[PDB]
Amino acid sequence: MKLKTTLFGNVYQFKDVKEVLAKANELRSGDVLAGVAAASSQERVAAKQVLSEMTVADIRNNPVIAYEDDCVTRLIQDDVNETAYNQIKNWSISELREYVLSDETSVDDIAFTRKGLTSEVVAAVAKICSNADLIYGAKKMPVIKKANTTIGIPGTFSARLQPNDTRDDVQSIAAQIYEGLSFGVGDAVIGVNPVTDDVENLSRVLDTIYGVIDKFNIPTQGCVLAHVTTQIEAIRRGAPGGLIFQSICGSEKGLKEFGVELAMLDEARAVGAEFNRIAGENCLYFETGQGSALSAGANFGADQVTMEARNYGLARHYDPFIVNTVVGFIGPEYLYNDRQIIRAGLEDHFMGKLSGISMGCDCCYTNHADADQNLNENLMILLATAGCNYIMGMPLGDDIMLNYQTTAFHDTATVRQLLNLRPSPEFERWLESMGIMANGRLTKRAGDPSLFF
Amino acid sequence: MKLKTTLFGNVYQFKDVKEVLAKANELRSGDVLAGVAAASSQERVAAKQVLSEMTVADIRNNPVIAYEDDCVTRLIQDDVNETAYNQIKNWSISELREYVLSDETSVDDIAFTRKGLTSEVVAAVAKICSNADLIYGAKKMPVIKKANTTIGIPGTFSARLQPNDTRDDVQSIAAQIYEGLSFGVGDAVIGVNPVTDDVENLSRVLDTIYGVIDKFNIPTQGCVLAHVTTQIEAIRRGAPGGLIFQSICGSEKGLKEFGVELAMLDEARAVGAEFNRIAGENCLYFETGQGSALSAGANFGADQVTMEARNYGLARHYDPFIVNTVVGFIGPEYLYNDRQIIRAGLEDHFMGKLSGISMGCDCCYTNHADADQNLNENLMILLATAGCNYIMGMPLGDDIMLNYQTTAFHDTATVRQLLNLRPSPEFERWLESMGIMANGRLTKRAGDPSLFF
Amino acid sequence: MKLKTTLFGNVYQFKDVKEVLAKANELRSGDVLAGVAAASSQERVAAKQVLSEMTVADIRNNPVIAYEDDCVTRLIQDDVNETAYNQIKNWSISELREYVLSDETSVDDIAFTRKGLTSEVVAAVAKICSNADLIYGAKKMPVIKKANTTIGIPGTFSARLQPNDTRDDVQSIAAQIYEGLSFGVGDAVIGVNPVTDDVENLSRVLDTIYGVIDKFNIPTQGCVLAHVTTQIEAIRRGAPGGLIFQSICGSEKGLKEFGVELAMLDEARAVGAEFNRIAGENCLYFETGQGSALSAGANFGADQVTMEARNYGLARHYDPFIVNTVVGFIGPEYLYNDRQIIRAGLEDHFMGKLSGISMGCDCCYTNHADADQNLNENLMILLATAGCNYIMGMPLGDDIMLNYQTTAFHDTATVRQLLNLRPSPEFERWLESMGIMANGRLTKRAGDPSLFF
Amino acid sequence: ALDLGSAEAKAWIGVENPHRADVLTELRRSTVARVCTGRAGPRPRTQALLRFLADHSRSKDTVLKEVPEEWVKAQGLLEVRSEISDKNLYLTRPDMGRRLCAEAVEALKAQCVANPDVQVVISDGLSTDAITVNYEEILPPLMAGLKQAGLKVGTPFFVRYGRVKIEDQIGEILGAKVVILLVGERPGLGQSESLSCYAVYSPRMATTVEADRTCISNIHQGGTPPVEAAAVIVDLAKRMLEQKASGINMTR
């Protein structure tokens, strides 16, 4: 493999695969902060060309963290289908990009080809894709999973109802739930980020969610996004189990920062199978997002796109019901403005779909970033056209305890009616019977939480 | 729990659950040979009534082989979703029967409920079902899996191409393959029962199957039904891996008779993931059939229908692409005649669908049983109306090396055109491009193996 | 024509066409009782081969009873289209079998070809058909007739409501009618076998049936299955006329045993046209069944399959609305067990459809035969897949005055929902308006006779 | 005119308007499977079904036929039987076919070589024809080959109404290091001649499981030639003696 190219007669020399991956990224603040970014537009393009000319094997065999030192690397590497690898190992990243985008490549062609990939290879393809490549390529890579709703069917669009509260006040939580349901939000999950991480409070919050689910026989699932350990103990002690959540990071060191061992996620799976109220086969829920590994000092000189793709390689082992990036959750130090937040969202979704996971996106931004709500509305529509499995929903997008803005309940109804997309089929039937939806559209009486009373 | 009832003024008293499960069976030669059968129609009916009045908990807590003595009991018991079990544990078997048959019970309702069952409970329901109950009940429990073809979609009907030869002659095998494909058979698998259980010969047979698959770009998978350990060894040495097969039995002792440890099936799953040419998520293939455990001295006083249900509970753990009973494969000593073979085929299919596995049936009989080819044609049509996931196909159903008669390639085309069913959608597309099928029907030039030349 | 063949080097010699027809039958008790059966499986196969090699003319010109001696023979022979006969007269029975089964033979091809047949030729084809041949061949030979409902359209399935009573108690009759209607039974006919054969009782029973028909404006027709003479006199005297019924037999001597002259059936037609409340053009109803002629000592050494086919040749002259065999109505001396009863049912239906009559089947058995209700459920589903025009219906199939078991009202609803078949379109509209059916399925409130009150 | 048992009947090609009729004959002689008979719609053609039925009637007959006692004598074989008394019971009571009768146990102790290295047993099992047809071809090369450059050869004998697990009891009674059972398989539709060999090292009724046996199946003129089979059996018994293991326990 070459680590060099000539661009307008100048030689650009790169040190290793890791540097090439990093410098090929479109400009983002996190990479600058990490000290891994291209020095010039010219160097960025030289990196892309070097990268485009490397082979699948070149990148498969040069993970940004070594097998011997990192259980996420080992998990990614041990899960490769070596027969599928051997078929594509000598393709260039350029040839792999064109393969994914081709209309002669079917969903089932990619189904086998992706098993020969590792996350660094997934990241490599994304780096030499334009924004429309990332949207079209992701659209033609649907990923379908099922809990009590089915998510990911082309022509559908789901949403997490996120009813958070600054005191975990069950009345405030319940009120946001009725409002969300009244817009058709909640087929992905009714999922609460709790303020307090204790078994009694988790059970209280879960009892609240399932009280609404059980009263109207809603086909959906609840979740409390506490640490996976306290979720497991709450469920073992009798709290209703729906999805089991954990925040993940793409390195062993990053997982340690979070206090997660891979053995806990094996436990989550086993606890889900024994206890959880899930009809289908998928019950886990992960969240990811660019900059996490670098924030933990656990990127090992790799760029945030490659570290994010390793999340999806980790996630795929556990076959979750849903994964989403929380695209601008952290701040401007990792993704600065609209441009970078849209790009990252398209990248994350595409890499997730290429990895075979049920990929959604929390289209969001913070108040210390150069972003506004018009940004979230741009990205959610772009990602919907990419077949994004789900987005979030809060009343007008204002999270009163996580201190950021996501998408509004309105936005899911807008996306669905704009693009003629439906909810998860099981949840759509319930909205029809509730009088909230008819032919994919909100009825006149929808949008009114008092309809449940 | 009651172990007695009064019928026409006479008391019918039973000793334990195991005896009630046994005498409730419709009469068959195997239960007589095992010593467990009812003495008379009256005692059979009395047993059904006692059984219908027992609860799910009564039967779940009384597996026919104790937990501490049998790894299959442990595998079945340990896979229960205890939340689903607790919801149903006080249902009588009579209520569980009516729930399965209810038109108000949806496919998703059963998806959760069945996770609360154990195989003995599944058997209990089948035992108090009429023939039309077993057919209608199964039809409303579809099970869909995906390898390189999708199997089990309601409205479709697949077939295993079974091209066996007395000497594993690759010319005889190929010849049968071309004939089978020309009738639209082979969307379940092209699977050979090999005569010599050795690595080089398995590779030769696999190489022959995949030469045809690769030459006409066929969406399907191949399989050689040797012992699972020799399949694993051949694939690890480079033979093309499609489905990995094993015969199974419903008790640990029965698995020992076959030379099978559960670790080997765990190994087959990991070998499939590292090596096998499969786009979808399912790559294992099991075969079952009433009388195997009794033959192995491994039924521990249980009847052959209960033992067969324990096969499906074992299978479900490994989420295989296909399972089928080999309904009359063995002889008259277990299933004597037409009546008994049809009844067992309906039972087996119903229990397999209730256990959530991809259940098909080798509709067959032997020349020392009281049966003929008209029986195969009766059963294949009834099971097709039950939504049976696949049957076998051989030229006129005459197996030149297993010495029994199965269904013809003709029979799959007959079933599909009789009932307006299609093949697996990926295989149907291939048949269309080959000019073999148009609108679910054989074209004029179909049924002619020389079409491939 | 040859009456001989060599099978495994042995010569099998047959005496006449009549013996060949008889010995070619699959084994059944009636033929043994009649002394016409093959002595061995080998002789049975030799008979089939001899039979397969005979021509249409060979069998047309050798009816089992001579023209000069039998008005049924003359009726059959005089009704042949000689142009259609002359086209096929030199086909072998083997070639005719393959013609019927071919997918290149259309419904309209068979429409003309069947006019060149006689009943003995129809029987000959059936004898060299396997069970699936009989099902597939019958399915592709639909026969559509119309009274006040249309019967026989592919994709539909009708049922006779059989509300019999041991005293002709009108309250018991009425109660069974409401129950039957509540399951969607009755689009073929509401037909009562009366205990007493007198004009006042027939009128009483007819008034009861038509009271229900008129009160809910049911598109259907009533019938009392008395001797045709008392039906005619009741209707002439003002009882409401719906279908006019007569039991038939395939010989002049057999008709005499029943007290029927062909002139009475000409009278039934004329009386139907003057009096009966029928919108369409078909108003007669016949019942048949294997063994009838032999029971009358009127088979003249012919086998029961050939004598049954001559029923259909007789029936076709009068173009009835419906005909059904009553397949196991008589007892084990004519059809012994499941095997023989299923076979006979498939044969009878196929021969009826080949003869161009609106053929249904009473799938039934007696308590002195080696049969049970699981047999009726096997056969009714097989025959439904063959496009059987209708079956019977009684509460759970228990006839309280004819002392036999037929199919339950449940079974028609099962067949329809299993196979996605609809009732007669006129009757389906009435069930929809009654709230009993929606999209071919029983609503929640169906199955409840109190819904009419 | 045609005899459905004739070779002409078996070779018949029934495909109409074939794409390449020469290939069809090529495929037809490639296999004994009933390929290339064509179709009538989706159903079998008349001749194909007639030949199927003919063969079935013949196949059924082979099930109940017994090897005459005089045949086993003219082969110089000692005859014992299982607990089964007749062919009808044989079909329904596999448990009794797996057990020697009390007289058979005594006849074996009285008239058989004790503690042999290799003990050969012959049984009709499910197909008389598989024995009477193949016996003269496989048995002498087998008995001779075990002697030649060999070892202690037990007394071969015939077991009437035998099932495979009965070889464990024979092994225990005789102290045989290796037991070889030649037995008829259940008859197929087109032939009833297929014989197989089940061989086990030092069996014990208590503990031997079925995977402890090595199987050699489909021994007949259409499968592995009986002469050829005897040679692989000899080598196999050598390996079982070398390895002190059988079935799944042997290397490779």
Ligand code: B12
């Ligand atoms: C019937 C049959 C079975 C039945 C046996 C049950 C029964 N009670 O009959 C069932 C369905 C259980 C079966 C299972 C298997 N069978 Co099997 N089976 C046959 C078949 C079609 C006929 C055997 C026969 O007629 N025996 C004669 C009668 C008189 O004997 P019996 O005492 O009634 O029956 C005993 C034998 O059949 C024996 N047996 C049956 N199969 C096998 C396989 C092996 C390896 C052994 C040692 C014994 C054995 O088990 C019975 C109980 O002791 C043959 C094919 C043939 N044409 O012979 C294959 C055949 C013998 N089986 C075979 C195989 C591969 C298997 C399996 C190992 C499959 C798997 N992947 O696990 C299993 C497990 C065997 C075991 N260790 O128990 C292969 C053997 C290949 C080889 N040379 O090793 C054969 C040749 C067919 C094939 N090519 O696939 N089988």
Ligand SMILES: C[C@H]1O[C@@H](n2cnc3c(N)ncnc32)[C@H](O)[C@@H]1O
């Ligand atoms: C802090 C809360 O938001 C989710 N979350 C937000 N941003 C990220 C990220 N970049 N990586 C992982 N998890 C994230 C966490 O998993 C938790 O739910």
Ligand SMILES: C[C@H]1O[C@@H](n2cnc3c(N)ncnc32)[C@H](O)[C@@H]1O
């Ligand atoms: C002997 C061959 O037939 C299949 N087979 C036939 N009958 C059964 C049964 N009852 N149980 C398991 N496998 C069976 C085996 O799996 C093997 O492939």
Ligand SMILES: C[C@H]1O[C@@H](n2cnc3c(N)ncnc32)[C@H](O)[C@@H]1O
């Ligand atoms: C006796 C009652 O049953 C009908 N029925 C029952 N079996 C037969 C048969 N084999 N032939 C003619 N009619 C029959 C009669 O026509 C009458 O309705």
